[PDB]
Amino acid sequence: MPSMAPVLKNIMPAIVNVAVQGYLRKFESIGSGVIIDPNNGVIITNDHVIRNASLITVTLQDGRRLKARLIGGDSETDLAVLKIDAKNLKSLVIGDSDKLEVGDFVVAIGNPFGLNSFGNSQSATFGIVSALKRSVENFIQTDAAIGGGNSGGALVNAKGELIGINTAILNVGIGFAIPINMVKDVAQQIIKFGSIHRGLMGIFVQHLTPELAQAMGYPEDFQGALVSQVNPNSPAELAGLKAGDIITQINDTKITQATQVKTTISLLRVGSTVKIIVERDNKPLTLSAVVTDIKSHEQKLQSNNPFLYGLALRAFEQESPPHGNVIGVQVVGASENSAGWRAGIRPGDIIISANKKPVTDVKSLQTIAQEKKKELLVQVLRGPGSMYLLVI
Amino acid sequence: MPSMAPVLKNIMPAIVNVAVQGYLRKFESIGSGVIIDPNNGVIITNDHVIRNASLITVTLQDGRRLKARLIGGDSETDLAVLKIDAKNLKSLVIGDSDKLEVGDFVVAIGNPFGLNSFGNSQSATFGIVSALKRSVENFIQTDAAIGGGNSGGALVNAKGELIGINTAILNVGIGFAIPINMVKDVAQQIIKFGSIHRGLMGIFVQHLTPELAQAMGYPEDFQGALVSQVNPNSPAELAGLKAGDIITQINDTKITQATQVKTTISLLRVGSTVKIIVERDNKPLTLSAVVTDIKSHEQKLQSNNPFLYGLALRAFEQESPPHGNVIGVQVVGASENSAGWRAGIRPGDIIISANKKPVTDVKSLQTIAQEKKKELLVQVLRGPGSMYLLVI
Amino acid sequence: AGDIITQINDTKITQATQVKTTISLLRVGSTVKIIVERDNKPLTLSAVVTDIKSHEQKLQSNNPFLYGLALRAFEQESPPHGNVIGVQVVGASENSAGWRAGIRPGDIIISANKKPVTDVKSLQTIAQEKKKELLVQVLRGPGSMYLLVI
């Protein structure tokens, strides 16, 4: 007689209750957690379960109510790692969430927002994987949900292995899970450093469909991640990556799915050399690239183009009463965080001279901006009036 | 390790996305579709998915976004057949939906109204058949639903065969499906003719319960469809069908269920001779009958009874101030679409003479109505007053 | 353009509004005789009313990827992309192959069948590469994406 009872009875102690008290006004909040290292008391829940906590208490199936410590959380991946100091703890076999398919049977273990606050008992619910993660697009999706779903709890496969960590967004009958492969890596890194310090690579990637594979000269079943854009002066550009490359391996991981790429890179730390294997018009190339600090990169960009950085510019000529024939460069956009904004330049402004010299096109503006001076004097037409501005 | 993953991976390409633009004000709308003939690009969705469309685009799992043509739809069965011109298409094995039982495991494949507009990925959800069709009464019913259910998508059995086509009426956790046997027949007929042209048979049928079987002199397990009424001058009457007959076979289909009968006959076309095998007080009889055009039949009825057609009549005698003793035939009802309504006759009218002659009962009225004349002069009492009317 | 219509078939044309009414009710397949003054010379033209769907069908497959698209040459510094050179999609008919593939007004086509796109003719020429698909790289705000127009 088949039943999930045997596997669940063994893994249930691994799931726990997570209770939080805090101020936002004082509030309560409860969710679930999973013990992923029994020897050191390391529990995973969602970041949103424990945000704003002054107090966090873990209740085990065995009855103990334990004071827990936050080792660190990561709001973007919605994960948080906790420590409790206690012995005789149980966990479960961790699995590989890259190996999941639509149609596999799963069980989600974790109380809904309403339920069994008081019993040391975690509700179980059964179903299949309905759709794989694809960044609702951001998670493993299931039809195993109860009460609008669980946060912090375990998603396990038919064997009892942990394949993800549940989460509850506000989809009737649909359950969501953060895949365990990603969870592992944010756990290690929060454990070692206390938080993820994301750096910059500058690679935008897209799902390689069979359609696109074939149109790009590869078989229908070919797998990889399509590079859709490589920014200028980005680490990916230094490394030789081009739009149209198909990424097939990063470091030790084979890429068969664009969603893979974006997770790996994310959780990788400024300083890391990264091996990227690429296919380009059917030739393999191995590029190497260094993750850099986002604020450093913005610095480079700024001190390289100190007066015009953050501005979108185009050539402009137009008879424009009351000014007569107006020739210049139109500021089409401007980041609030630019020397240009700070000096007063706004979108819609026409720059008609720089350092008292006439400006005809963008190039002509960029050249004068290269002049080794402390400041750029800029004359702008703005609708029917005009200002001189100083860009420092 | 059991899993629905292998069967679903093979049939998933058969399911598609259906996107529609139109005016009702412009609107969008998306549902799903199933490819039932890969060689000719023939897709099934629901009629309600594609109604009011000026544009219909099919997205395949492989990535192609394809312009689709409406070959025809049928709002009563809520089905619509589509063509796309494209090669390398996949379908699935079509199954027999007469063979389904409560308790069989099923998977419904198709995105809910909310979900994955953008991924070429169709959500899957798992369960059992909860109740068989019984015309909510009109469909196969399941506990495989997500997000309030899918329209246009596939319902498949444990083997991966298509057993129905999903539909979403506005029942939490309950999924509905239009059974595939019916779908097949409306597809062929929409393909050949562009739409279903329903004719008239005139057979009302009822579920034969064990209770009723026994009370009618057959074993508890006897199957068939109970004829509850046969209209006068109907094709079923010409063919010899009587109330109390138990239909057991129509053409090539054995009838074990009343719901069967009504579908078959429906989709059958004016002109078709139809074999009906019947049981009557335990003797088998084979009747033959011809489907006729509904408007022709109404014509026959009218030109046969040209002045009184569409009227409900009873004998009437009553002392009725201020009229004294009133003898006549009371019009108890009247169809707006009758020579009688058009002339002014209303329910509650007493017909007291016809062609200047007194009317005592219905029969007496019918006889004068048979007179070979261009018109019927009718004198009516209406409450306290009276009108002469001319029925043409 | 600048011809003056004085007659359509046997109806005589004295105002602009008659033209719509005389012609709208003419059936597909008809020969229509349009009589005109052009520089004070009378001419008589003959034209065949076509089916609307068939005409749009003809424009469509005669221009299979770019039909319905309003397009202009585009050069602009555009943080974070740097200097973006390409063809801006200014309008896109909701029934075009381009709209179907995913293109939207605002997008900048920066490459086609893997070559750089500079002016509108450069895109038109690449579009004529003898295929059943045009591969386009579009820049949309800070992102980018490959689409296949079919």
PDB file of N, CA, C and O in Angstrom, chain A residues 361-391:
ATOM      1  N   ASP A 361      27.076  68.811 -32.879  1.00  0.00           N
ATOM      2  CA  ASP A 361      26.605  67.460 -32.648  1.00  0.00           C
ATOM      3  C   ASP A 361      27.222  66.919 -31.375  1.00  0.00           C
ATOM      4  O   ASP A 361      28.006  67.584 -30.712  1.00  0.00           O
ATOM      5  N   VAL A 362      26.843  65.698 -31.063  1.00  0.00           N
ATOM      6  CA  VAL A 362      27.237  65.043 -29.864  1.00  0.00           C
ATOM      7  C   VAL A 362      28.740  65.006 -29.773  1.00  0.00           C
ATOM      8  O   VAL A 362      29.330  65.566 -28.824  1.00  0.00           O
ATOM      9  N   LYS A 363      29.362  64.394 -30.776  1.00  0.00           N
ATOM     10  CA  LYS A 363      30.833  64.348 -30.897  1.00  0.00           C
ATOM     11  C   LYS A 363      31.438  65.704 -30.573  1.00  0.00           C
ATOM     12  O   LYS A 363      32.379  65.847 -29.779  1.00  0.00           O
ATOM     13  N   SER A 364      30.851  66.736 -31.139  1.00  0.00           N
ATOM     14  CA  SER A 364      31.450  68.063 -31.005  1.00  0.00           C
ATOM     15  C   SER A 364      31.400  68.466 -29.555  1.00  0.00           C
ATOM     16  O   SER A 364      32.287  69.127 -29.071  1.00  0.00           O
ATOM     17  N   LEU A 365      30.334  68.035 -28.852  1.00  0.00           N
ATOM     18  CA  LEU A 365      30.185  68.294 -27.414  1.00  0.00           C
ATOM     19  C   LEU A 365      31.168  67.467 -26.579  1.00  0.00           C
ATOM     20  O   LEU A 365      31.830  67.978 -25.655  1.00  0.00           O
ATOM     21  N   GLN A 366      31.259  66.187 -26.904  1.00  0.00           N
ATOM     22  CA  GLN A 366      32.193  65.318 -26.193  1.00  0.00           C
ATOM     23  C   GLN A 366      33.652  65.854 -26.261  1.00  0.00           C
ATOM     24  O   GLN A 366      34.343  65.932 -25.246  1.00  0.00           O
ATOM     25  N   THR A 367      34.088  66.278 -27.448  1.00  0.00           N
ATOM     26  CA  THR A 367      35.461  66.832 -27.569  1.00  0.00           C
ATOM     27  C   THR A 367      35.757  67.983 -26.588  1.00  0.00           C
ATOM     28  O   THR A 367      36.736  67.922 -25.820  1.00  0.00           O
ATOM     29  N   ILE A 368      34.912  69.021 -26.600  1.00  0.00           N
ATOM     30  CA  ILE A 368      35.080  70.123 -25.650  1.00  0.00           C
ATOM     31  C   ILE A 368      34.988  69.638 -24.228  1.00  0.00           C
ATOM     32  O   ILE A 368      35.640  70.165 -23.338  1.00  0.00           O
ATOM     33  N   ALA A 369      34.173  68.631 -23.977  1.00  0.00           N
ATOM     34  CA  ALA A 369      34.110  68.098 -22.610  1.00  0.00           C
ATOM     35  C   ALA A 369      35.422  67.425 -22.209  1.00  0.00           C
ATOM     36  O   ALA A 369      35.678  67.244 -21.032  1.00  0.00           O
ATOM     37  N   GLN A 370      36.235  67.016 -23.160  1.00  0.00           N
ATOM     38  CA  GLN A 370      37.506  66.400 -22.790  1.00  0.00           C
ATOM     39  C   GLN A 370      38.540  67.422 -22.323  1.00  0.00           C
ATOM     40  O   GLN A 370      39.522  67.018 -21.736  1.00  0.00           O
ATOM     41  N   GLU A 371      38.296  68.719 -22.527  1.00  0.00           N
ATOM     42  CA  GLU A 371      39.260  69.761 -22.151  1.00  0.00           C
ATOM     43  C   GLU A 371      39.597  69.723 -20.664  1.00  0.00           C
ATOM     44  O   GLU A 371      38.700  69.667 -19.787  1.00  0.00           O
ATOM     45  N   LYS A 372      40.904  69.749 -20.387  1.00  0.00           N
ATOM     46  CA  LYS A 372      41.438  69.519 -19.029  1.00  0.00           C
ATOM     47  C   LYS A 372      41.201  70.762 -18.178  1.00  0.00           C
ATOM     48  O   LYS A 372      42.091  71.588 -17.978  1.00  0.00           O
ATOM     49  N   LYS A 373      39.974  70.911 -17.715  1.00  0.00           N
ATOM     50  CA  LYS A 373      39.596  72.109 -16.994  1.00  0.00           C
ATOM     51  C   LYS A 373      38.787  71.687 -15.773  1.00  0.00           C
ATOM     52  O   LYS A 373      38.501  70.513 -15.599  1.00  0.00           O
ATOM     53  N   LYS A 374      38.488  72.641 -14.902  1.00  0.00           N
ATOM     54  CA  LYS A 374      37.840  72.323 -13.627  1.00  0.00           C
ATOM     55  C   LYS A 374      36.314  72.230 -13.783  1.00  0.00           C
ATOM     56  O   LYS A 374      35.625  71.711 -12.920  1.00  0.00           O
ATOM     57  N   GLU A 375      35.815  72.678 -14.931  1.00  0.00           N
ATOM     58  CA  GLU A 375      34.422  72.982 -15.083  1.00  0.00           C
ATOM     59  C   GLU A 375      34.057  73.170 -16.540  1.00  0.00           C
ATOM     60  O   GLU A 375      34.882  73.600 -17.351  1.00  0.00           O
ATOM     61  N   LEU A 376      32.799  72.873 -16.847  1.00  0.00           N
ATOM     62  CA  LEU A 376      32.256  73.047 -18.162  1.00  0.00           C
ATOM     63  C   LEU A 376      31.169  74.120 -18.109  1.00  0.00           C
ATOM     64  O   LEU A 376      30.128  73.962 -17.460  1.00  0.00           O
ATOM     65  N   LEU A 377      31.423  75.228 -18.793  1.00  0.00           N
ATOM     66  CA  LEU A 377      30.388  76.236 -19.017  1.00  0.00           C
ATOM     67  C   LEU A 377      29.478  75.854 -20.219  1.00  0.00           C
ATOM     68  O   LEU A 377      29.928  75.595 -21.318  1.00  0.00           O
ATOM     69  N   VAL A 378      28.185  75.817 -19.975  1.00  0.00           N
ATOM     70  CA  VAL A 378      27.217  75.273 -20.936  1.00  0.00           C
ATOM     71  C   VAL A 378      26.120  76.316 -21.068  1.00  0.00           C
ATOM     72  O   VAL A 378      25.667  76.840 -20.053  1.00  0.00           O
ATOM     73  N   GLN A 379      25.757  76.657 -22.297  1.00  0.00           N
ATOM     74  CA  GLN A 379      24.640  77.556 -22.559  1.00  0.00           C
ATOM     75  C   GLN A 379      23.514  76.688 -23.090  1.00  0.00           C
ATOM     76  O   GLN A 379      23.728  75.920 -24.023  1.00  0.00           O
ATOM     77  N   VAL A 380      22.341  76.757 -22.448  1.00  0.00           N
ATOM     78  CA  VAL A 380      21.189  75.964 -22.857  1.00  0.00           C
ATOM     79  C   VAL A 380      19.983  76.816 -23.194  1.00  0.00           C
ATOM     80  O   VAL A 380      19.739  77.811 -22.510  1.00  0.00           O
ATOM     81  N   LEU A 381      19.262  76.446 -24.268  1.00  0.00           N
ATOM     82  CA  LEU A 381      17.910  76.952 -24.526  1.00  0.00           C
ATOM     83  C   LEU A 381      16.940  76.019 -23.827  1.00  0.00           C
ATOM     84  O   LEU A 381      17.095  74.820 -23.885  1.00  0.00           O
ATOM     85  N   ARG A 382      15.973  76.587 -23.110  1.00  0.00           N
ATOM     86  CA  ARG A 382      14.905  75.810 -22.463  1.00  0.00           C
ATOM     87  C   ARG A 382      13.606  76.455 -22.819  1.00  0.00           C
ATOM     88  O   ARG A 382      13.337  77.589 -22.428  1.00  0.00           O
ATOM     89  N   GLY A 383      12.806  75.751 -23.595  1.00  0.00           N
ATOM     90  CA  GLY A 383      11.652  76.390 -24.235  1.00  0.00           C
ATOM     91  C   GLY A 383      11.970  77.752 -24.842  1.00  0.00           C
ATOM     92  O   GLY A 383      12.767  77.859 -25.788  1.00  0.00           O
ATOM     93  N   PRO A 384      11.351  78.810 -24.311  1.00  0.00           N
ATOM     94  CA  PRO A 384      11.525  80.124 -24.928  1.00  0.00           C
ATOM     95  C   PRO A 384      12.647  80.958 -24.327  1.00  0.00           C
ATOM     96  O   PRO A 384      12.956  81.999 -24.888  1.00  0.00           O
ATOM     97  N   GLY A 385      13.253  80.479 -23.230  1.00  0.00           N
ATOM     98  CA  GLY A 385      14.334  81.180 -22.507  1.00  0.00           C
ATOM     99  C   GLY A 385      15.677  80.442 -22.512  1.00  0.00           C
ATOM    100  O   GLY A 385      15.819  79.420 -23.180  1.00  0.00           O
ATOM    101  N   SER A 386      16.660  80.957 -21.760  1.00  0.00           N
ATOM    102  CA  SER A 386      18.032  80.442 -21.820  1.00  0.00           C
ATOM    103  C   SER A 386      18.783  80.653 -20.548  1.00  0.00           C
ATOM    104  O   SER A 386      18.675  81.706 -19.951  1.00  0.00           O
ATOM    105  N   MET A 387      19.624  79.680 -20.213  1.00  0.00           N
ATOM    106  CA  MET A 387      20.486  79.741 -19.065  1.00  0.00           C
ATOM    107  C   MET A 387      21.910  79.334 -19.393  1.00  0.00           C
ATOM    108  O   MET A 387      22.138  78.441 -20.184  1.00  0.00           O
ATOM    109  N   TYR A 388      22.875  79.985 -18.762  1.00  0.00           N
ATOM    110  CA  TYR A 388      24.209  79.432 -18.679  1.00  0.00           C
ATOM    111  C   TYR A 388      24.296  78.676 -17.389  1.00  0.00           C
ATOM    112  O   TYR A 388      23.755  79.117 -16.402  1.00  0.00           O
ATOM    113  N   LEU A 389      24.983  77.544 -17.412  1.00  0.00           N
ATOM    114  CA  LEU A 389      25.117  76.642 -16.269  1.00  0.00           C
ATOM    115  C   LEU A 389      26.564  76.242 -16.137  1.00  0.00           C
ATOM    116  O   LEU A 389      27.323  76.250 -17.117  1.00  0.00           O
ATOM    117  N   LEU A 390      26.947  75.867 -14.924  1.00  0.00           N
ATOM    118  CA  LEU A 390      28.306  75.410 -14.691  1.00  0.00           C
ATOM    119  C   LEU A 390      28.292  74.033 -14.166  1.00  0.00           C
ATOM    120  O   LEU A 390      27.690  73.771 -13.119  1.00  0.00           O
ATOM    121  N   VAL A 391      28.969  73.160 -14.895  1.00  0.00           N
ATOM    122  CA  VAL A 391      29.024  71.764 -14.558  1.00  0.00           C
ATOM    123  C   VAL A 391      30.345  71.532 -13.906  1.00  0.00           C
ATOM    124  O   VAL A 391      31.410  71.785 -14.487  1.00  0.00           O
TER     125      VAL A 391
END
